[PDB]
Amino acid sequence: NMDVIGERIRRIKEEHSSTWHYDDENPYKTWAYHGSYEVKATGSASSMINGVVKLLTKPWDVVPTVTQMAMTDTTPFGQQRVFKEKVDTRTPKPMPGTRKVMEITAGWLWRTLGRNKRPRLCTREEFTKKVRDSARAAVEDEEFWKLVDRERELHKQGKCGSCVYNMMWLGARYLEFEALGFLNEDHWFSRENSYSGVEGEGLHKLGYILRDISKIPGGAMYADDTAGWDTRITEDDLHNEEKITQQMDPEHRQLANAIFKLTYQNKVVKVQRPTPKGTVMDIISRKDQRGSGQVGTYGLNTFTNMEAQLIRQMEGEGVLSKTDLENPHLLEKKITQWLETKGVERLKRMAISGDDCVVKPIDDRFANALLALNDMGKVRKDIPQWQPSKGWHDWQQVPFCSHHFHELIMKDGRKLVVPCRPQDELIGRARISQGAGWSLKETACLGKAYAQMWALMYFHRRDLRLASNAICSAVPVHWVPTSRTTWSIHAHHQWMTTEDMLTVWNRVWIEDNPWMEDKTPVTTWEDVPYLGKREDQWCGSLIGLTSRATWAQNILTAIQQVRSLIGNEEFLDYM
């Protein structure tokens, strides 16, 4: 406890020895409270609207899903209400039999994941290349690595001085990246290496993967959401995730054990809180849960979700009974036999990206196999704890990574599998600019990035292809898209290029598409298919409405208004 986190609290206390106090009425119930100090508020209750795509998407000014997405709250008040919901809770300790099967499955899973790859340290040169107090992009060119070296020497002694978490210091995240970044950089959770994973595959491939899973004989496809996954990571999960250190070299194992013991299994967090005296940052700590702003959070969530779904498949097939989960002397024989004879096959029945999961069990007993899932702490969201799960018998209805996927028939007979989501979520996100003082050019370039992402991923939506062509017609051709649209893991960002969208389309969907055997290229957007009109409307299309027809037939007027305000540059007509 204080032996691991004491030095961190001391340095925070001495750096703010002025304005240091113990608020006797702190609102923390499951976190250990230490102290507080005052700082200026950070964040905002609303976000800036991207005027370029807003002016080109007038019918969606009157849409509630779009209007809501401009009111996110990152203020210290918003910081505190999200803390009450699920962060300030305790997850009950799993039963002794459940803890054994988790430990057996975790070790078997780590051996399988490391059958070809060996763990390795990540480097300052890697961290510096990936970025392309607190820190920005003046810091890697600064010799701030002397700070990193001094903290690493503390980690080599099993101590920690300045690795805290903010609901970050770049030095602590490098040290974490140095010891655990190999999971992401070496793609341990690619589908080839992990069977269930989808890391590096990309949003344009997830639908094909779900379609391949549907070919496996079995029951329905299940995709249960977990209520607050990061808050349900137990001390047993962290101990099971730590077993990867057994495959490391001694110098790597030492730095990773330091990350696990001093940064994951013990954590110091500074959180902002409103008070009748201003804005106050509090210093709390706990021994479980997972920090969301961490490298390897995705990989360790993926690993633990893989293990948990494997265990639920065990219970569905009758390998695990209630008596087994209660038994502190549970035998390993039938658990080990099942994993070594069926484990890889059962892993192939799943698509798992962090807490998002899709599994196709061998039959539908899985739907009512809930003893281990609930006892492990991964309680499903918005459903009675023991009510059976509802699965889908059509992979196209299965939700995964905030998407569903449609199989489309091109006019030449070839088949595409495209990602899709309710259209208001796509338009509402595109109308949101990130930050404060950005010029019209940077605002238009971000809108161009969303337009080209729609041309690559959501071309099959009539409203989006029209809006994408209007945005690209209103933004100068030579302007390069800035920032990122998705901020997500599955985004390969093939739309950031200024290559012809139809050329990039042919590369993504034909040339590089492993599920497309006919490499015959598409020569015109007219040969790029849409969703069925019924499906398009089911997923939020405004086609058929007169406000959409008026907007479509008068779209060049809105494009010219944006061009008039942008200035005298080179434009192209894409309509």
Annotated binding site for Zn(2+): 151, 155, 160, 163, 404, 406, 420, 539
- Min CB(425)–Zn ion separation in Å: 11
C-beta separation of 485 from 449 below 8 A: yes
Number of shown-chain residues binding Zn ion (CB under 5 A)? 5
Judged by CB, which is closer to Zn ion: 176, or 241? 176
Judged by CB, which is closer to Zn ion: 165, or 229? 165
Judged by CB, which is closer to Zn ion: 103, or 425? 425
Q: Which stretch binds Zn ion (CB under 5 A): 94-102, 163-171, 297-305, 491-499?
A: 163-171
Judged by CB, which is closer to Zn ion: 88, or 535? 535
* DSSP line for 94-145: PPHHHHHHHHHHHHHHHHHHTSS-------HHHHHHHT-----SSSTTTTTH
- Min CB(539)–Zn ion separation in Å: 3
The Cα 560–Cα 151 span in angstroms is: 56
Nearest to 507 by CA among 453, 439, 570, 456: 456
Q: Which stretch binds Zn ion (CB under 5 A): 316-324, 351-359, 535-543, 555-563?
A: 535-543
Judged by CB, which is closer to Zn ion: 5, or 163? 163
Coil vs helix vs strand at 196: coil
How many CB atoms lie under 10 A from the CB of residue 140?
19
Judged by CB, which is closer to Zn ion: 113, or 401? 401
Q: Give alpha helix (H) positions in 458-574.
A: 462-474, 501-506, 533-538, 546-553, 555-566
- Min CB(396)–Zn ion separation in Å: 8
Q: Which stretch binds Zn ion (CB under 5 A): 13-21, 160-168, 347-355, 367-375?
A: 160-168
- Min CB(474)–Zn ion separation in Å: 27
Q: Which stretch binds Zn ion (CB under 5 A): 50-58, 80-88, 143-151, 501-509?
A: 143-151
C-beta separation of 259 from 179 below 8 A: yes
The Cα 80–Cα 27 span in angstroms is: 9
How many CB atoms lie under 10 A from the CB of residue 575?
11
Positions in 391-450 near Zn ion (CB under 5 A):
420
- Min CB(445)–Zn ion separation in Å: 28
- Min CB(535)–Zn ion separation in Å: 6
Judged by CB, which is closer to Zn ion: 98, or 266? 266
C-beta separation of 373 from 308 below 8 A: yes
Q: Which stretch binds Zn ion (CB under 5 A): 11-19, 148-156, 323-331, 517-525?
A: 148-156
- Min CB(267)–Zn ion separation in Å: 11
- At residue 352, φ and ψ (nearest 5 deg) are -135, 120
For Zn ion, which residue of 55, 160, 244, 453 counts as binding (CB under 5 A)?
160
Q: List the binding residues for CDP.
A: 228-230, 301
Q: List the binding residues.
A: 151, 155, 160, 163, 225-226, 228-230, 301, 355-356, 404, 406, 420, 539
How many CB atoms lie under 10 A from the CB of residue 293?
10
- Min CB(437)–Zn ion separation in Å: 35
- Min CB(210)–Zn ion separation in Å: 13
For Zn ion, which residue of 164, 180, 474, 539 counts as binding (CB under 5 A)?
539
Per-residue binding string, Zn ion, 506-525, x by CB under 5 A, is: --------------------
Judged by CB, which is closer to Zn ion: 426, or 555? 426
Contacts of 24 (CB under 8 A, 6+ apart): none
Counting Cα atoms < 13 Å in the Cβ hemisphere of 424 gives 16
Q: Which stretch binds Zn ion (CB under 5 A): 29-37, 332-340, 379-387, 532-540?
A: 532-540
For Zn ion, which residue of 147, 163, 401, 432 counts as binding (CB under 5 A)?
163
Q: List the binding residues for Mn(2+).
A: 225-226, 355-356
Q: Give alpha helix (H) positions in 295-422.
A: 297-316, 322-326, 333-347, 371-375
The Cα 475–Cα 484 span in angstroms is: 17
Judged by CB, which is closer to Zn ion: 232, or 460? 460
Q: Which stretch binds Zn ion (CB under 5 A): 50-58, 449-457, 486-494, 531-539?
A: 531-539
The Cα 257–Cα 247 span in angstroms is: 12
C-beta separation of 223 from 357 below 8 A: yes
Judged by CB, which is closer to Zn ion: 110, or 127? 127
How many CB atoms lie under 10 A from the CB of residue 530?
15
- Min CB(7)–Zn ion separation in Å: 9
The Cα 51–Cα 350 span in angstroms is: 41
Query: What is Dmax (Cα atoms) for the chain?
Result: 78
Judged by CB, which is closer to Zn ion: 95, or 539? 539
Judged by CB, which is closer to Zn ion: 5, or 160? 160
Nearest to 224 by CA among 376, 99, 332: 376
Cα torsion 393, 394, 400, 406 to 10°: value is: 180
Nearest to 452 by CA among 422, 421, 483: 483
**Structural tokens at position 214:** 């549907």
- Min CB(91)–Zn ion separation in Å: 26
Which residue has tokens 């800035």? 482
- Min CB(504)–Zn ion separation in Å: 22
In single-letter form, the type of residue at position 517 comes to E
Coil vs helix vs strand at 436: coil
How big is the chain by its Cα radius of gyration, in Å? 26
- Residues found near Zn ion in the complex (CB under 5 A): 151, 160, 163, 420, 539
